[PDB]
Amino acid sequence: RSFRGPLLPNRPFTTVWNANTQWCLERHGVDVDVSVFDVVANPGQTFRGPDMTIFYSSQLGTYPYYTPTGEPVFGGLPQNASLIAHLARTFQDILAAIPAPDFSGLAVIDWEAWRPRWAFNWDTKDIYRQRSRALVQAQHPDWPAPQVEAVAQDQFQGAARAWMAGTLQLGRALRPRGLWGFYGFPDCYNYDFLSPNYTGQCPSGIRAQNDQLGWLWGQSRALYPSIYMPAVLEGTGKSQMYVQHRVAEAFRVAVAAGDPNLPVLPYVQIFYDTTNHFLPLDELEHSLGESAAQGAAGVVLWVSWENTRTKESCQAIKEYMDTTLGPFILNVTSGALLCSQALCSGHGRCVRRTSHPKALLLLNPASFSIQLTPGGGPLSLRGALSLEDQAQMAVEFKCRCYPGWQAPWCERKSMWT
Numbered sequence: 001r002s003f004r005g006p007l008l009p010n011r012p013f014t015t016v017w018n019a020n021t022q023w024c025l026e027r028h029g030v031d032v033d034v035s036v037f038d039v040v041a042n043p044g045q046t047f048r049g050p051d052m053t054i055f056y057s058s059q060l061g062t063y064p065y066y067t068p069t070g071e072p073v074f075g076g077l078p079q080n081a082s083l084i085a086h087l088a089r090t091f092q093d094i095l096a097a098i099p100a101p102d103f104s105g106l107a108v109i110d111w112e113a114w115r116p117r118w119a120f121n122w123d124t125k126d127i128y129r130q131r132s133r134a135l136v137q138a139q140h141p142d143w144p145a146p147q148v149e150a151v152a153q154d155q156f157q158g159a160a161r162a163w164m165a166g167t168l169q170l171g172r173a174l175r176p177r178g179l180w181g182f183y184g185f186p187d188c189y190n191y192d193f194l195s196p197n198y199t200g201q202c203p204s205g206i207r208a209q210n211d212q213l214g215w216l217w218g219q220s221r222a223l224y225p226s227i228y229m230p231a232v233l234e235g236t237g238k239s240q241m242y243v244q245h246r247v248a249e250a251f252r253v254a255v256a257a258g259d260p261n262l263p264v265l266p267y268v269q270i271f272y273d274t275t276n277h278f279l280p281l282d283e284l285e286h287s288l289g290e291s292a293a294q295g296a297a298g299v300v301l302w303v304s305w306e307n308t309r310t311k312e313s314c315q316a317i318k319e320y321m322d323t324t325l326g327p328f329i330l331n332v333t334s335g336a337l338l339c340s341q342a343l344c345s346g347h348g349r350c351v352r353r354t355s356h357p358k359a360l361l362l363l364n365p366a367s368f369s370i371q372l373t374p375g376g377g378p379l380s381l382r383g384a385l386s387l388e389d390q391a392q393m394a395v396e397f398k399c400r401c402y403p404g405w406q407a408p409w410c411e412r413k414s415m416w417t
């Protein structure tokens with residue numbers, strides 16, 4: 001189903017800086033170096049470029065939700081809204097947001113109110129369930145509880161699916177080269193950090209509910225799972241297992257939906273989620289490094305407006321970029337590229353062997369040096385991949401070939417090409 005190799009030339013692992021660092025500069029005179037990234041995409045949506053479009057929930061058709069005081073917008077619930085009116089506006093929204101018909105960048109839809117699986121609408125999302133029950137109870141006033149539940153569950157899930165599949169399908173009909181997918185899907189729901197037996201595994205019937213979203217995976221042309229690291233992870237040893245299984249679940253549903261090649265691009269932050277606490281180098285490896293080592297197509301680094309608001313914040317990002325983040329980005333991007341070239345003939349991604357569950361794609365500091373060019377050109381890389389570095393890759397990593405290239409080493413084009 002998917003036929004893209006590396007999303008950008010020489011980039012098995014691509015990075016998108018999704019930060020308003022433009023504000024840091026224009027408002028505060030703080031100049032954050034963003035040259036290490038493949039893509040800079042302002043979440044403030046200042047320009048319309050070839051590499052990323054984002055649709056926030058108020059930008060693509062008529063997305064129904066409840067305000068936090070419970071008032072409906074466009075009907076609150078997909079079964080209480082007009083799909084036909086949504087699709088009309090969606091058609092026009094896509095053409096205005098994405099003027100090039102051959103646009104081939106990320107096309108991220110950000111729908112975070114209700115979830116398509118009835119089971120996942122818990123906590124503050126239980127309003128979608130309560131209101132689903134209310135809607136059938138008003139239409140049929142003399143109806144017992146387990147009967148409004150089952151009718152509510154089917155109406156909701158039926159509607160939620162028509163809306164999400166129809167929007168993705170229309171996006172792809174109009175822009176067939178867009179890497180269309182929803183932010184935050186799949187979710188592994190492995191937030192059980194306080195439990196003795198924490199493995200990071202997606203609980204119980206979570207995977208089973210995700211299998212019921214095969215229709216969603218089929219309609220997707222990239223997957224954008226979130227690997228934001230909750231505040232509670234800070235200073236424990238559970239970050240890597242949490243991330244590992246969230247990335248793995250995105251590959252798992254891709255393979256089961258008959259698209260082993262579906263680009264997976266997790267969303268990450270450089271802070272613990274909801275905080276101004278920068279991720280230690282450590283935690284970068286456990287998140288961006290982890291994603292690359294599973295063969296992620298790249299990562300989207302989302303930086304909240306909360307973190308680029310002030311001069312102080314912006315200046316702490318500038319310095320984090322120089323000391324920690326930027327060298328790390330070049331490190332992981334180059335490790336992935338060099339491995340692809342040395343192991344996979346330049347025609348596949350290196351992916352962990354299962355015998356080496358924690359291996360990462362990084363540069364040996366004995367073979368390479370990453371340094372800032374004086375005055376401040378971009379980071380340079382000096383040195384060379386040693387024969388021992390290459391021997392270590394051969395033991396830790398195998399190949400997942402780009403579509404069209406044959407396993408195991410991606411040396412020859414495949415059969416039906």
Ligand SMILES: *[C@@H]1O[C@H](CO)[C@@H](O[C@@H]2O[C@H](CO)[C@@H](O[C@@H]3O[C@H](CO[C@H]4O[C@H](CO)[C@@H](O)[C@H](O[C@H]5O[C@H](CO)[C@@H](O)[C@H](O)[C@@H]5O)[C@@H]4O)[C@@H](O)[C@H](O[C@H]4O[C@H](CO)[C@@H](O)[C@H](O)[C@@H]4O)[C@@H]3O)[C@H](O)[C@H]2NC(C)=O)[C@H](O)[C@H]1NC(C)=O
Pocket residue numbers: 281285328331332360362363364365366368369370
């Ligand atoms: C490319 O990117 C990766 C960035 O992740 C760089 O590799 C990382 O470098 C950092 C800092 O230099 C390392 O952090 C230190 O780790 C040690 C523990 O080291 C041992 O355990 C690791 C896994 O558990 C393992 O990977 C290590 O093996 C490598 O590292 C050494 C060099 O340190 C080298 O000799 C080997 O050949 C391997 O390459 C090793 O077995 C930890 O003790 C360190 O302590 C620091 O922090 C504590 C705070 O608690 C402080 O008390 C210490 O004194 C010290 O400051 C430190 O965290 C990290 O292990 C590396 N990660 C990996 C996966 O290699 C790499 O350098 C970059 N390359 C380029 C070209 O720049």
Ligand SMILES: *[C@@H]1O[C@H](CO)[C@@H](O[C@@H]2O[C@H](CO)[C@@H](O)[C@H](O)[C@H]2NC(C)=O)[C@H](O)[C@H]1NC(C)=O
Pocket residue numbers: 071072074075076077080131132134135
């Ligand atoms: C179903 O959708 C309708 C809109 O068609 C919702 O009705 C609106 O409700 C608000 C606040 O309760 C009123 O101010 C509007 O006048 C209503 N609009 C119209 C034109 O009817 C209704 O609340 C939704 N039902 C559920 C269960 O969410």
